[PDB]
Design a protein around this ligand. Structure first.
Ligand SMILES: [Au+3]
Ligand SMILES: [Au+]
Ligand SMILES: [Cl-]
Ligand SMILES: [Cl-]
Length: 129
């Protein structure tokens, strides 16, 4: 599924991502935009053989099991495939663990490089909420 901006914002809010660990909803929408362009089915292989999955490009090295990332963990306790669902519940639950791990949203390199410090409220500008 390819979400629209406000549609994604609303879903993230429903699953309690709004101001989770102090990160406003716009930060999460901005990260989703540059991580996956709002496409739940997005996958990308990393140089190290891990793969990133879904709307927030969660990495098989640490957070999900895809069965082809030797030495990797599965800290969200889920198959990576679940992170590609039209329903974002699994990706949000896992994102909550990731942003809590110590470095906040810097865990998402595209958030650091393209969202941190910017006017992220623009991402939720106009959304009925
Ligand atoms: Au923080
Ligand atoms: Au949802
Ligand atoms: Cl939920
Ligand atoms: Cl959803």
């Amino acid at each position: 599924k390819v979400f629209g901006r406000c549609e994604l914002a609303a879903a993230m809010k429903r699953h309690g991502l709004d101001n989770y660990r102090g990160y406003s909803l716009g930060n999460w929408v901005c990260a989703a935009k540059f991580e996956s362009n709002f496409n739940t089915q997005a996958t990308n292989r990393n140089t190290d053989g891990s793969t990133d999955y879904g709307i927030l490009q969660i990495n098989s090295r640490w957070w999900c099991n895809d069965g082809r990332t030797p030495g990797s963990r599965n800290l969200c306790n889920i198959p990576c495939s679940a992170l590609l669902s039209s329903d974002i519940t699994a990706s949000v639950n896992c994102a909550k663990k990731i942003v809590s791990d110590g470095n906040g949203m810097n865990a998402w390199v595209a958030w650091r490089n393209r969202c941190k410090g910017t006017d992220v409220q623009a991402w939720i500008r106009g959304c009925r909420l």
